[PDB]
Amino acid sequence: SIDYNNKKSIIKKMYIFRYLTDKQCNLLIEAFRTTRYEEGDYIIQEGEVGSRFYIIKNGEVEIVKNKKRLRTLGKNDYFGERALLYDEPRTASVISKVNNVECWFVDKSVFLQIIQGPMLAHLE
């Protein structure tokens, strides 16, 4: 309940999901799962092909390129959205800034199956 309503509230108001149907959105909310990181963990590694999208539940992360911090993201911020449409190398790294970081994430595998929904044929 609480975790569902939590990510529901965030997901539903996000720009990048504004075209989803309520049916799609519900599948999507249920598809997100929590993942935990400790201080200094690489959440995303620059140069790898991205396949996940992340929303910060607890904590902070930093976006890093060429060992330089580009910015800090905190609770309810999100990152990695291009991976949900494009198959391309990550342009930067994302590093867990503190212990006990928690993100909701979804893989493009799951997301695309959901976006595909309206293309699936009815019997009648």
Author numbering: 403 to 526
Text taken from the publication that reported this structure:
Recent studies discovered that the P. falciparum cGMP-dependent protein kinase (PfPKG) is involved in both asexual and sexual development and specific inhibition of PfPKG blocked progression of the life cycle at multiple stages.
The final model containing residues 403–526 shows four ordered sulfate ions, with one of the sulfates occupying the cyclic phosphate site due to a high sulfate concentration in the crystallizing condition. The N-terminal portion of the αC-helix (residues 520–526) forms a loop, providing crystal contacts with the PBC of the neighboring molecule in the crystal lattice. The αC-helix is not ordered in the absence of cGMP, but becomes ordered upon binding cGMP and shields the cGMP pocket. The α310-helix of the N3A motif interacts directly with the PBC.
